[PDB]
Write a protein that binds this ligand. Structure first.
Ligand code: HEM
Length: 152
C-alpha cells in the first residue's frame, strides 16, 4: 500500500530508468547474476556467460533486461492495480521458469543497488523508500500467487 506521494516518487525514479531502459536492465541483470550466481542457472540462454565481461558484451542480456524492466515499468505504472499484468508473470515465473521468491528479492535489491550506482546522490532517501515499497508490493503480490500455486 503506497500513498499517492509514494507512487509519485516511484514514477519519478522510473523516469530515470526509462531514459536508458536497456542500460538499467543490463546492469540489473548483471548485478543479479554476479551477486547471486545461482540465478544465472535459471537462464538456459545466459548460463554460458562465465565472466562479467561476457555478460556486459551480451546483446541478448541487454535485450532481456529491456524485456524485464519494460514489464516491471508497466506494472509500476498501474500504481498497485496490476493484477492483470502481474498474474502471467507470477504464473510463468512459478510454473515455467521455477523462480523462487528469494530471487525476486535479489532482483529487487539489485534494482536499488543499480539506481544508486547509476544515479549516485540522485536517488534520495524518500525515493529509495518509495521504490522499495513498490518492489515489496510487487514481490508480495507475486508471493500470494506463488502460495496459491504451492510453489516454493
Ligand atoms: C522484476 C522482476 C522480474 C520481471 C518483471 C520479469 C519479467 C520477465 C518477463 C516479462 C519474461 C518473459 C515473459 C515470461 O516468460 O513471462 C521473463 C522471462 C524469464 N524470467 Fe523473469 N522477470 C523478473 C525476475 C526474474 C528473476 C529474478 C529470474 C531468475 C533469477 C527470472 C527468470 C526468468 C527466466 C529464466 C525467463 C525466461 C527467459 C528466456 O529463456 O527467454 N525472472 N521475465
Amino acid at each position: 500500500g503506497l500513498s499517492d506521494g509514494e507512487w509519485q516518487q516511484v514514477l519519478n525514479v522510473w523516469g530515470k530508468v526509462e531514459a536508458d531502459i536497456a542500460g538499467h536492465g543490463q546492469e540489473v541483470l548483471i548485478r543479479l547474476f554476479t551477486g547471486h550466481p545461482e540465478t544465472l542457472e535459471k537462464f538456459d540462454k545466459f548460463k554460458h556467460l562465465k565472466t562479467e565481461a561476457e555478460m556486459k558484451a551480451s546483446e541478448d542480456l541487454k535485450k532481456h533486461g529491456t524485456v524485464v524492466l519494460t514489464a516491471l515499468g508497466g506494472i509500476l505504472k498501474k500504481k498497485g492495480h496490476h493484477e492483470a499484468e502481474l498474474k502471467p508473470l507470477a504464473q510463468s515465473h512459478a510454473t515455467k521458469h521455477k523462480i523462487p521468491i528469494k530471487y525476486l528479492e535479489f532482483i529487487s535489491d539489485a534494482i536499488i543497488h543499480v539506481l544508486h550506482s547509476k544515479h549516485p546522490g540522485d536517488f534520495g532517501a524518500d525515493a529509495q523508500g518509495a521504490m522499495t515499497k513498490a518492489l515489496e508490493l510487487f514481490r508480495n503480490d507475486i508471493a500470494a500467487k506463488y502460495k496459491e500455486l504451492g510453489f516454493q
